[PDB]
Structure formats: C-alpha cells, structure tokens
C-alpha cells in the first residue's frame, strides 16, 4: 500500500463488486491467532500508478496474474541475515514476481534481480517559498550611472 | 482593502524618520552656533517644513556645512516621498483580485475540495451526463451530496452566498442573468 | 575503448611536440588525470587518413580510470572510425545489413565496451546489453538572451 | 535655488530680479518636473517586479556542513528507521548526529511543522515529496529542483533470479518510454496543478532594512558635513 | 469630495477665529486651498505658532491625499 | 528554458554476453551509492560561474532622455537671443 | 450591458485616517494654545 502508487479501497456498495478501471486484488487477512484460518481473501479494489503500468504490461505480453497485499511490516529489511516483507516473500518466492514502491541498492540487487527503473528519485531538499524583497539598494537603481 | 496610514510604511519606520528629523534639526542648529563668521526654533521649523513640504517659516542656513546638510535633507525628504508614492501605487495596482473560474477544466473545479462547493438539479440530463462520463467520476461523487430540488431554489440559494457555482442549460441561465442583473454567467 | 568528441564530457586536445600533452591542475590544485588518445587527424579521416596520437581527459575519462582501478585491468583506447553514435544502415545490398558509426564499430569487433555519452533506446538495447544509468538528461530548448532597454 | 527647484520646491529660495533669468529658471523647473515624473514612474514600475528569491546548492552547502558557524543554527531532519536515514548515516556522520535532535514522526507532521515555522527544511524521497508538493493546497511549497541528487536511483520491478522474462519486460518498459505513454501516466497521476503555477508578485511593505541605503547616505553626509566644518575652521583660523 | 470641502471650510474658520486672537478669512481659505494643489499659488503665512501647527497638519493631510489620488489614477489607466 | 521531456539516461554499452557487463552494472550502483558520482558531477559539470535571477525592470539610458537636454540648450540660446532683444527694447525706451 | 470593471474606487471609511488625524491635530492645537498663553503669561 502506497499513498501515491498503490491505493486500496472497498467494493462498491451499489453493486457489491469493484467499479470499472480497477484490478481485483485479494487482500490477505489473517486475524485468528488460536488456530490458523482458511485461505483468507477479501475482495478489494486496488488502483494507482504502478497498477496502470502492470495492466499495460499484462496487455502487451500475455500472462495471468493475481495480486495480494504484503503481510507484515514493510517491503524490505535485512534483519537477522534474512529478508521479510516483499523481499522476504521473494526469497522463498512462491509468487515469481514483486511490484510496488521498491528501491534499488547494492544488497537487494545482489540478492534479487531488478528491471529498468520507470521513475527517478533521490535525496531532495524541501522548503517553503519566502516573500520577496526590494533589493534595498534600489533607491538609486531606476537610473543610469551617467545621467 | 487597505489601511490609511500604516499600510505602505511601518510604524517603527515612522518613528525612525521622526527621530532622524529631530536629530537633523539640532545638527543644523549647532553648525552655526559652533562655527566662526541659528535660532534653534527657526532651525527646527525649517527642518520640519522641508520634510512636510509646508510653506511655513522664513529661515535659511547662512553657513556652508549647514547649507549642504539642508540640501541633503531636502533630497532625503524627496526620495522618501518618492518611495512612499511608488510603494502606494504598487500596492494599489496589485490588489485587484478576481477568481473568475475559467470553466469545467479549471483546477479548482477539476478536483473536489472543501473550499469550493457546486451543485446541479437532481434527476435531470446533467445527472445522466455526469454518470456516463468516467473522467468526472470524482466530481460526480462530490456533487451527488449537494443536489438541489429545482432551479427555483438553486438560483435563490446562489445569491444567498450559500453556494459557489451552479450549472444548467444556456438559454435558462442566460435569461436568468439578463432578467436579473445580479449574477453573470 | 571507443569514445566520441563531446566538450562537456570528453575533451580532445592535440599533444605537444614532445609526444604528450602538457599537464596542469584544477582550481583547487588537484592533478587532472589524462590518458593518451589514438584517433583520426584534426579535421577528418577523409583527406588526412592518419592516426595521430592525441590525449583525452574529462568526466568519462576519470570514470573509466576508476572503473579500471577497481576492476584491476588494462586498456587501450581508440577514437571512433566514422564519427557517429550508431544507426541502422539499410542499403538495397541484398546480402548486407548492419549498424554504422560507433555502434557499428562495436558490433564489428573494434572494441568490447563503450565508454561514451550514449543514449538508451529500444532498438539499441534490443541487440546489445546496457548497464544502469549513471546520468539523467532530458531534452530541452535553447534561446538567446537580450538585455532589455527603454 | 537651482538645486531646490529639482526636489519638489521644499527649501526657500531667493528669486532674481531680471526676466531672462526668470525664463531660464522656468525652463529649469519644467526640466525638473519632467525628471521627477520620470523618476517616480520608474520607481513605481520597479517595485512591482520582485519575486522568486530562494535557492540552495545541495548536500555540500555550508548550511548543512557548518550549522553553527553561521546565523542561528539551521534545522533539517526526517523520520528514523528508513532508507534515507540509513544512507545519510552511512554517508554523513556529523550531519546525522546534528539532525538527530529534529527527528520528526511522519511526513504530514513534518509538512505541518514546516508550515508552522517549527522546522526549516525537509530531507526525504524525491518522488513522494514532489507529489505532495504538486498536489497540495496552494503552491507555497516547492522542492529545490532536480539539480544534484546524492544516491540517485529509481524504482524497479523485482523479478525472480535468472528469470528469462526480465529481457521481455525490459524491452516492454523501453517501448513504454519510446511511445510516450509513461509521460501521459506521469502527467495524469504524478504531475499536479502547481507545476504550471507562475510566480505571484506581492508587496514587501518597505521594512527598515530597505531604507538602509538612504540612512547610510545621510550618515555619510553628516560625516562629510563635520569634516568640512573642521576644515573650514582650520582654514579660517589662520 | 464634499467631506474634504466642508472640512477645509471648518478647519480654516476655526483656525483663523480661535488662533488669530490682517489675516482675514479670505487669505486663510486661499492658503488652505493652495496647500492641497501642490503649493503652486503664492500664499500669506500667519504669525502665530498654533496656526502654523494647524497648517502643517493640513499640509501633511494634503500630501497624503495627493499621494493616494496619484496612486489610484495610475492604477486606473492600466485596466 | 523549458521543461524536460523524454528523460532517458545514459549507459555503458557492451556485447550480448560478458561478465564485464554485470561487473560494471554492479560497480556503477556501488559508485552511485557511495558518492563518487556526486564528486565527479560537482567537479566536471557544476561550474556555476553565473547565477543571476530574472530581471524584469528596465533601466532608463541617456539617449532616451536627450530631449530635456536639447530643450534646455535651445532655451539657453533663445535666452541669449532674448537678452539681445531685451537690451534692444530697453535702449528703445 | 456592462463591460468588466477592474479598477476599484476608494470609499470614505477606508480614508477616515486623515480626518481622525486632523481632528486630533485641532484638539491638540487648542491645548497647545492653552499651553502657549500659559508660557506667554509666564514670561
């Protein structure tokens, strides 16, 4: 789930299904703690930015797919010499693919492969616009030096 | 939408100019009372009359240093008045705001927001036109919670500043605008 | 190695009469690392078809220096043959179809790697292998500036 | 008289008794009126075109490297336990040790803190900040441009190791760029409304530091007046 | 306009009558009228001090009036 | 002046199959994650010999205002001619 | 039928400042005339 990339929503109450221009994502639900629960899929409607690229890829090259949200914590982490989240799911793959707001670095590229990035990013500063000034030497500005 | 005195100038700047002219008066006075070869009252009168441009008082410095200092003070008053007039004109010419939303593709109207409300007539052709378009699904979902009964109540509520935008046909809207010179499409 | 002439990336200058090019330093004083360049003549390979040894220096030069340092190998650079990035050369030429320019020289077998400001496209990466981007440059426009006046 | 006639006619003067001198001073007064009118016009035209003054260099600026050896200490930070935090800790030890005081708790919290003036800057990912800036209420927030960005990378698509499908999807992504559909997607979902917002001029209200020029001019004039008084006294004493 | 006119009248009358006890009401009105139009016509200044303060305040008011008028007139011709 | 479009990055080329390919593909990522590329950029690209914001107002030159100077010169010459006419009229009466 | 009108006219309440200032000046002037006749009687 990513606010600008992968937005999750609920089914339409007027139809009990997902609206048009959306992809049916089976959100994994595991709540029972005393006993493992049956395969838990909640009909969700996922849409955003990466979803459009994924749909266009599936339309270009012929293959089938069925997304499902990550289980615990985050997308990537290398604690205890082991991966969790999406990367940890890719370790013992069982999915053969992974999408979302994933970053590229040395370790995650030496562990798993990566394709060509479709968007640029990096460390960027963020500040608020400041009110303008008058160039306090402007009392002699609107005139030539010879006149 | 401006203030009379303290809009183009700061009060601390007013106090600074006052202290400056008060000091300049004494400085012009001393230059004659401490030089070989200045009626402090008349000197202060001259110092005040040069800045405020008033034609009161009959006094002129008879020295040379006092004379050049008076010339510099006159130039200072002139440039101060010029800067004041320039700033006032700039602030009075750059304070004419007018939203005048362009149309359907306006950024304020393209995306739903709580600072801009608009409605239409429920159970009409506009509802079908908005339900059939997929690009305006967000705008339709936003306007769904504001639909009015008919145009008779909507036009009356628009002038009551309860709403901010209303959509209808061309003929009805043009006639309502022409026969009542209060709103303009 | 194959490299093309671009001033902001790859400077080219003629060597002195001794056989190399005079060294210099940067603004802070660091020694600008250069390398010998064996390419065509000054104007073109057309009339003066000779291989005069020049010296090159620039961004890609020090990048290749660092890459060879960390990879611990040796190199022998040489300029491009025709003076072009690379494109398809479709001549009637029933038994002939190949690339021209630097891409053609690479596909021919003149060198192994390409250390130059080369772009990435579909047809380019379709045949050869590329690496991760080391720069991000988008096209833009350029107009002249005139100082205003009354 | 000829000097007073150019500064609005504020100081008293002594008019001559002739007629041609009167015509001359009348022509001079007309010239001075034209001069003052043009000066006032240009000065009013000047104050309406000042805006867009803000810029920083990058992660090598004196503001980030030397917080204390400058104006009162600058502020900049982000949330811990992140990729950006780990990178800035592995790269700039002292910068992280300094910024550890201003560690925020989120993104919207940091935006509100910047809007309230509690924080001076913000260091986070480029894509999310660009989105939240282009798709925000008002256009008062803006980045420092692409320029130079340390640890420049992109968002890829993870694929299982040694998968042949990677070659196909690479060419697919390249064709997406070549066709222009990616630009349309970026303009529809990522590009906001503030991207096409021009600069908005305003009024500076003429603070004290603005008249520092004329204040220093008056001070130097008083100093020259004292110098000339001393010189005249010395010259007339003998 | 009528406000500043009646104010000029009241100020001139009160000034001359109160603080003037050859400076009649005609010359006072002429001076108080000339002080609003840039100071172009000659005038006859009084001999007192409170009348001087009054005419100085009036000159400041006239300067503010002229500045605002010029600002609004320059703003008008651009639209 | 303008906005970017078709933002495609550069890259190092090589043949279809070689270990040097992956070696360079890893070394470039390591350099980017280290800081060498930023130093190279600030050294060979970031010249920054000119930083000037937009200047909208235009200053008045001297030739544009030669009018008042010509007018005052004509006034001076007409004044000396008027002094001739004035002494003539004075001698007349 | 009325074209767009961009300029805004100045009202009276927006400029009540100069009127208040001149009224304060008049009352301070009558007080100053009291102080003036007092100082004249002193000397």
DSSP letters for A109-121: HHHSEE---SSEE
Q: How many CB pairs under 8 A join A and D?
A: 215
Query: CA–CA distance from C64 to each of C72, D189, F28, F44 (Å)?
Result: 11, 39, 11, 14
* Rounded-to-integer distance, Cα B135 and Cα B139, Å: 9
Of B4, B96, B181, the CB nearest to G6: B96
First to last CA, chain D: 32
Would you call F76 and D24 a contact, using CB atoms and an 8 Å cutoff? Answer: yes
Q: What token pair was written down for E63? A: 């300067």
Measured between CB atoms, does B14 come within 8 Å of chain D? no
Q: Which helix (H) or strand (E) holds C56?
A: strand C52-58
Q: What token pair was written down for F61? A: 């030159």
Closest to B107 (Cα-Cα) out of D32, C38, D191: D191
* Rounded-to-integer distance, Cα A126 and Cα A135, Å: 25
Query: CA–CA distance from C136 to each of D65, D174, F7 (Å)?
Result: 26, 15, 7
Chain A residues with CB inside 8 Å of D146's CB?
120, 124
* Rounded-to-integer distance, Cα D217 and Cα D219, Å: 5
Of E56, E68, E75, the CB nearest to B93: E75
Q: What token pair was written down for C1? A: 């190695």
Would you call D158 and A112 a contact, using CB atoms and an 8 Å cutoff? Answer: yes
Sign, CA dihedral G14-G18-G20-G21, equals positive
* Rounded-to-integer distance, Cα B52 and Cα E60, Å: 6
* Rounded-to-integer distance, Cα C49 and Cα C43, Å: 10
Question: To the nearest 5 percent, what fractions of chain C are helix, strand and coil?
Answer: 20, 25, 60
Contact A85, A73 (CB under 8 A): yes
Contact C33, C61 (CB under 8 A): yes
Q: Which helix (H) or strand (E) holds E28?
A: helix E25-34
* Rounded-to-integer distance, Cα B166 and Cα C63, Å: 63
Closest chain E residue to B85 measured between Cα atoms? E67
Task: Count CB neighbours of C8 within 10 A.
Answer: 11
Measured between CB atoms, does E35 come within 8 Å of chain B? yes
Contact E18, E46 (CB under 8 A): no
Contact F13, C117 (CB under 8 A): no
Number of helical H runs and strand E runs in chain F:
3, 1
Contact F68, D35 (CB under 8 A): yes
Tracing tokens 């100085």 back to the chain, one arrives at E56
Q: What token pair was written down for D10? A: 């504020």
* Rounded-to-integer distance, Cα F89 and Cα D131, Å: 86
Q: What token pair was written down for F2? A: 């303008």
Exposed, middle or buried: residue F75 (CB in 10 Å: 0-12, 13-18, 19+)?
middle
Resolution to 1 decimal, in Å?
4.1
CA distance A93 to chain F (A): 23
**Residue D84, annotated as binding a ligand:** yes
Strands (E) in F1-93, as ranges, are 5-9
Closest to D76 (Cα-Cα) out of A122, A127, A129: A127
Query: CA–CA distance from F47 to each of A137, C27, F2, F44 (Å)?
Result: 29, 11, 21, 7
Sign, CA dihedral E49-E50-E56-E58, equals negative
Which segments of chain C does DSSP mark as H helices, in order? Answer: 59-71, 101-108, 122-127
A43, β-bridge pairs: A26
CA distance A2 to chain F (A): 24
Sign, CA dihedral D185-D188-D192-D198, equals positive
A123, β-bridge pairs: D125
Q: What token pair was written down for A122? A: 């990096």
* Rounded-to-integer distance, Cα D91 and Cα F36, Å: 12
Would you call C136 and D152 a contact, using CB atoms and an 8 Å cutoff? Answer: yes
Strands C10-13 and C2-3: unpaired
What 3-state class would DSSP assign to E74? helix
Contact F27, C70 (CB under 8 A): yes
**Residue A136 per-residue DSSP state:** T
Chain A residues with CB inside 8 Å of D121's CB?
125-127
DSSP string across D49-95 = S---------TTSHHHH-SSSSSS-------SSSHHHHHHHHH-HHH
Spell out a b/e string for G1-12, using b for 16 or more CB atoms within 10 Å of the CB, else e. eeeeeeeeeeee
DSSP string across chain B = ---SSSSSS-HHHHHHHHHHHHHHHHHHHHHHHTS----HHHHHHHHHHHHH----------SSHHHHHHHHHHHHHHHHHHHHHHHHHHHHHS--------STT-HHHHS-BTTB--B-BSSSHHHHHHHH-STTHHHHHHHGGG-BS-HHHHHHHHHTTS-S-B---HHHHHHHHHSSTT---
Would you call G36 and E53 a contact, using CB atoms and an 8 Å cutoff? Answer: no
Q: What token pair was written down for B3? A: 């203030």
* Rounded-to-integer distance, Cα D46 and Cα D44, Å: 5
Of G7, G10, G18, the CB nearest to E64: G18
A19-26 long-range contacts (CB < 8 A, ≥24 apart) are A19/A45, A20/B134, A21/A47, A21/B134, A22/A46, A22/A47, A23/A47, A23/A51, A23/A54, A23/A55, A23/A67, A25/A67, A25/A68, A25/A69, A26/A66, A26/A67, A26/A68
Chain B residues with CB inside 8 Å of D237's CB?
36
Of F5, F53, F82, the CB nearest to D53: F53
Contact A12, A5 (CB under 8 A): no
Exposed, middle or buried: residue E12 (CB in 10 Å: 0-12, 13-18, 19+)?
buried
Of B5, B53, B58, the CB nearest to E59: B53
CA distance F61 to chain A (A): 6
Number of helical H runs and strand E runs in chain C:
3, 8
Strands C78-79 and C2-3: parallel
First to last CA, chain G: 73
Tracing tokens 């130093």 back to the chain, one arrives at F39
**Residue A2 per-residue DSSP state:** B
**Residue D108, annotated as binding a ligand:** no
* Rounded-to-integer distance, Cα D61 and Cα A128, Å: 18
Backbone angles phi, psi at A91, to 5 degrees: -55, -60
Closest chain G residue to E4 measured between Cα atoms? G19
What 3-state class would DSSP assign to A68? coil
Q: What token pair was written down for E43? A: 């005038």
CA distance A110 to chain F (A): 8
A7, β-bridge pairs: A47
- Cα-atom radius of gyration of chain F, to the nearest Å? 37
Of C114, C134, C138, the CB nearest to F13: C114
* Rounded-to-integer distance, Cα A51 and Cα A32, Å: 30
* Rounded-to-integer distance, Cα F36 and Cα D151, Å: 10
Would you call F62 and A144 a contact, using CB atoms and an 8 Å cutoff? Answer: yes
Backbone angles phi, psi at B68, to 5 degrees: -70, -35
CA distance G27 to chain B (A): 20
Chains in contact with F, where contact means 3 or more Cβ–Cβ distances below 8 Å, are: A, C, D
Would you call D28 and F32 a contact, using CB atoms and an 8 Å cutoff? Answer: no
Closest to A5 (Cα-Cα) out of A64, A107, A85, A75: A75
Please state whether at least 3 CB pairs lie below 8 Å between chains E and B. Answer: yes
Task: Count CB neighbours of G28 within 10 A.
Answer: 15
Question: Residues with Cβ < 8 Å from A132, sequence gap 6 or more?
Answer: D50, D51, D52, D53, D201, D202, D204
* Rounded-to-integer distance, Cα B75 and Cα B50, Å: 10
Chain E residues with CB inside 8 Å of G18's CB?
61, 64-65
Query: CA–CA distance from C46 to each of C6, C49, C59, C80, C86 (Å)?
Result: 20, 6, 29, 13, 19
Query: CA–CA distance from D110 to each of A83, D7, D76, D136, D193 (Å)?
Result: 30, 53, 10, 14, 22
Would you call B5 and G8 a contact, using CB atoms and an 8 Å cutoff? Answer: no
**Residue D208 per-residue DSSP state:** G
Q: What token pair was written down for A134? A: 């008058």
Backbone angles phi, psi at D143, to 5 degrees: -80, -175
* Rounded-to-integer distance, Cα D74 and Cα D64, Å: 8
Tracing tokens 């950006």 back to the chain, one arrives at D84
Helix G16-42, helix E50-76: angle, nearest 10? 160
Chain F residues with CB inside 8 Å of D34's CB?
68
Q: In what order do the strands lie in the sheet with A6-9?
A: A6-9, A41-48, A23-28
Please state whether at least 3 CB pairs lie below 8 Å between chains E and F. Answer: no
Chain D residues with CB inside 8 Å of B27's CB?
222, 225
| Chain B residues 81-110 with a CB less than 8 Å from chain E | 81, 84-85, 88-89, 92-93, 96
Measured between CB atoms, does B15 come within 8 Å of chain D? no
* Rounded-to-integer distance, Cα D235 and Cα B32, Å: 17
């Amino acid at each position: 789930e990513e606010a600008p990339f992968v937005i999750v929503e609920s089914v339409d109450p007027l139809s009990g299904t997902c609206m048009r221009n959306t992809v049916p994502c089976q959100k994994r639900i595991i709540s029972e703690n005393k006993t493992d629960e049956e395969p838990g899929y909640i009909k969700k409607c996922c849409k955003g930015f990466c979803i459009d690229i994924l749909k266009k890829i599936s339309k270009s090259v012929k293959f089938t797919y069925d997304l499902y949200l990550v289980t615990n914590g985050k997308h990537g982490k290398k604690i205890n010499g082991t991966w969790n989240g999406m990367i940890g799911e890719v370790v013992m793959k069982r999915a053969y693919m992974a999408v979302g707001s994933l970053t590229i670095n040395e370790e995650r590229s030496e562990v798993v492969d990566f394709s060509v990035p479709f968007i640029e990013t990096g460390i960027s500063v963020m500040v608020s616009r400041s009110n303008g000034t008058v160039s306090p030497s402007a009392f002699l500005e609107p005139f030539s030096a010879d006149v | 939408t401006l203030d009379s005195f303290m809009q183009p100038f700061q009060s601390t700047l007013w106090l600074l100019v006052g202290l400056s002219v008060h000091v300049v008066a004494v400085m012009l006075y001393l230059l004659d009372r401490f030089s070989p070869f200045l009626t402090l009252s008349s000197a202060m009168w001259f110092s005040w009359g040069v800045l405020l441009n008033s034609g009161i008082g009959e006094g002129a410095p008879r020295s040379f240093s006092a004379r050049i200092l008076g010339m510099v003070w006159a130039g200072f008053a002139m440039i101060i008045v010029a800067s004041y007039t320039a700033n006032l004109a700039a602030f009075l010419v750059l304070d004419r705001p007018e939203e005048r939303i362009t149309g359907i593709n306006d950024p304020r109207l393209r995306n739903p927001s709580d600072k801009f409300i608009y409605a239409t007539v429920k159970q009409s052709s506009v509802d079908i036109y908005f339900r059939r378009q997929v690009e305006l699904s967000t705008m339709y979902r936003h306007m769904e919670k504001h639909n009015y009964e008919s145009a008779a109540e909507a036009i009356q509520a628009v002038r009551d500043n309860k709403l901010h935008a209303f959509i209808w046909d061309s003929a009805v809207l043009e006639f309502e605008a022409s026969q009542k010179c209060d709103l303009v499409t | 190695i194959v490299t093309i002439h671009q001033e902001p990336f790859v400077y080219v200058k003629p060597t002195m009469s001794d056989g190399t090019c005079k060294e210099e330093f940067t603004v802070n004083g660091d020694p600008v690392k250069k390398v010998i360049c064996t390419g065509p003549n000054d104007t073109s390979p057309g009339s003066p078809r000779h291989t005069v040894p020049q010296c090159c220096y620039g961004f890609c030069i020090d990048l290749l220096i660092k890459l060879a340092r960390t990879m611990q190998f040796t190199y022998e650079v040489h300029l491009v043959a025709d003076g072009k990035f690379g494109t398809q050369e479709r001549v009637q030429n029933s038994n002939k179809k190949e690339w021209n320019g630097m891409m053609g020289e690479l596909l021919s077998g003149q060198a192994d790697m390409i250390v130059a400001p080369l772009t990435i496209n579909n047809e380019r990466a379709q045949y050869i292998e590329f690496s991760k981007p080391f720069k991000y440059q988008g096209l833009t426009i350029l107009v002249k500036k005139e100082i205003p006046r009354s | 008289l000829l000097w007073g006639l150019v500064f609005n006619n504020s100081v008293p003067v002594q008019n001559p008794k002739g007629t041609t001198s009167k015509i001359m001073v009348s022509v001079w007064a007309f010239f001075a009126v034209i001069f003052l009118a043009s000066y006032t016009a240009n000065l009013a035209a000047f104050m309406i075109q000042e805006e867009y003054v803000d810029q920083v260099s990058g992660l090598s600026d004196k503001k980030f490297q030397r917080p204390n050896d400058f104006s009162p200490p600058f502020r900049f930070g982000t949330v811990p336990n992140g990729s950006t935090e780990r990178n800035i800790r592995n790269n700039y030890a002292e910068m992280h040790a300094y910024m550890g005081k201003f560690n925020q708790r989120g993104v919207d919290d940091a935006l509100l803190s910047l809007k309230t003036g509690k924080l001076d800057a913000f260091i986070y990912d480029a894509a999310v900040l660009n989105y939240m800036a282009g798709r925000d209420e008002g256009c008062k927030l803006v980045t420092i441009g692409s320029g130079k960005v340390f640890a420049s990378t992109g968002y890829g698509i993870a694929i299982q190791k040694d998968s042949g499908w990677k070659r196909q999807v690479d060419l697919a992504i390249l064709q997406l760029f070549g066709d222009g559909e990616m630009e349309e997607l970026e303009a529809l979902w990522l590009t906001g409304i503030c991207h096409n917002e021009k600069n908005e001029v305003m009024s500076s209200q003429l603070d004290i530091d603005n008249m520092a020029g004329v204040f220093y001019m008056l001070g130097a004039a008083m100093a020259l007046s004292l110098i000339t008084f001393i010189c005249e006294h010395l010259f007339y004493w003998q | 306009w009528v406000m500043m006119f009646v104010m000029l009248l009241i100020v001139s009358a009160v000034a001359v009558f109160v603080f003037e006890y050859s400076f009649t009401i005609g010359k006072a009105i002429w001076l108080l009228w000339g002080l609003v139009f840039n100071n172009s016509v000659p005038v006859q200044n009084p001999k007192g001090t409170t009348s001087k303060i009054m005419v100085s305040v009036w000159a400041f008011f006239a300067v503010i009036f002229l500045a605002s008028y010029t600002a609004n007139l320059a703003a008008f011709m651009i639209q | 002046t303008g906005e970017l479009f078709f933002r495609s990055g550069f890259g190092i080329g090589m043949r279809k199959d070689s270990p040097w390919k992956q070696q360079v593909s890893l070394s470039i990522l390591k350099s980017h994650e280290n800081g060498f590329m930023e130093d190279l950029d600030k050294t060979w690209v970031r010249y920054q010999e000119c930083d000037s914001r937009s200047n909208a107002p235009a200053t008045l030159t001297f030739e544009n205002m030669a009018g008042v100077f010509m007018l005052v010169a004509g006034g001076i010459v007409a004044g000396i001619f008027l002094i001739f006419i004035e002494i003539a009229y004075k001698r007349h009466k």
